[PDB]
Amino acid sequence: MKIAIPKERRPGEDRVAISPEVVKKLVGLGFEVIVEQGAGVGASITDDALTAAGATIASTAAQALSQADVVWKVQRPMTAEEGTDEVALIKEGAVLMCHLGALTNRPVVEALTKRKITAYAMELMPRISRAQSMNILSSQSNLAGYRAVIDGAYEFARAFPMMMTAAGTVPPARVLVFGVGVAGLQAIATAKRLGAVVMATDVRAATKEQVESLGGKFITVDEFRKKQAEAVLKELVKTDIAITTALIPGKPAPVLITEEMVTKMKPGSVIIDLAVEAGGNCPLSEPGKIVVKHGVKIVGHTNVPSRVAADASPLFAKNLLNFLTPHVDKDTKTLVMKLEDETVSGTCVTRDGAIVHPALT
């Protein structure tokens, strides 16, 4: 079979759904691997590095996808309604694996269904231990958590660590991480290793132990418990960098720092709002912008995993590889996807010209 990987066409997307290591593994499984010219450039992967690994290079996207039985992408393909019909480039009856956003983008799901394309939405990977290696949500959001700290340190006008000098002593930065999922934990780790005093808060109670296991301090209080909002504010007033990561799928992001809260922060402070694409944990944040209000920088970059595209791409490619590998026969050149497999049934949104996933039928 032929597997194809195009360049990502959406603005600002520098990731690619391939790496030289994964090319090597795919050829070993009996695939012909085709990559579009310049697809890995944003991810620091040259055409020469992929040819060396065993891949063929196609000069255009249409040529890459023309005869491909399997297609791997990072973001969902663009539709004719978006002005560039990428789904039409994909061969009829073929298999697509990518981050679809299927539960919030039914038009692309319908457009793939018209071409009888079998689409697997990688974001719908079930939360089971054996599928951890296939989870794109965790691999990408982990780097986003690291990157939040780097972006925060860049926008901050003081150094992170304490420094004892002959000229005098400058204090460490104080960091407050809102939301302690995968992204929040890596932000705690990165802020901490850089020398900052790190606080964290999360609504879940099992989080306290996880925060402490990284040397962070969890915000605690000791009927109507809004002494919690009081305990958070007490720390937020001393905070130099606030990183907010709280995300609810399908829904707007919860408001964790109001404008009233921002006004009480000191000048030179910086908020990194990683929920900005879903409305933001702070109302003042704007997608793709750094806003300055009340002396505070409100940083709202889009596609934060793409700001670490060269480390993000090999992990994304490995997630797909791990998902696809158990279904390659190689006694006949066929990809037989197994229906009783929970990763297959969990991620399949449409196949053979019919919508399959229960949430979209």
Binding site: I128, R130, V182, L185, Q186, A189, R193
Partner: protein, 174 residues
Amino acid sequence: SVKAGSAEDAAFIMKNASKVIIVPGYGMAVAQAQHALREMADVLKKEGVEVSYAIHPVAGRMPGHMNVLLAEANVPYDEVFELEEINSSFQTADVAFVIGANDVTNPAAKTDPSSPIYGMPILDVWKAGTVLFIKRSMASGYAGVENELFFRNNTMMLFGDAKKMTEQIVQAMN
């Protein structure tokens, strides 16, 4: 069943050994036992014993959880190995020093198909001559299931806090 041991026991087993693989997990992070751990490796390497670290891809509760703490403790990178690099090295190792790890070593990932961790790769720590688990009690891990290796003939349980116990092992060594 459970062969319980002390810091004094662990001290001579690892010093008499010529090769030790350290297996850190979530409990290591909870106790912040990394500095005492690297200290224990140092007194081992000075004794002539070759020491390594086996890192499961999902040890702890986040990606790179063990890495950041081992780095904080100044553990050199050349002693640190991923699961696929080091899983065949347990055979040639005298001791598997498992500190605050559980599900990561649990063989029910290969055996029991009804197990929550079935299909997940694991570290074959039992292939070592002796296995020593540091954990506070007989409680389960994240998966909430029991571990067959606690009752295995080449396993010695070392009950206590991961930082407290490891500090005592450094004291029981000279």
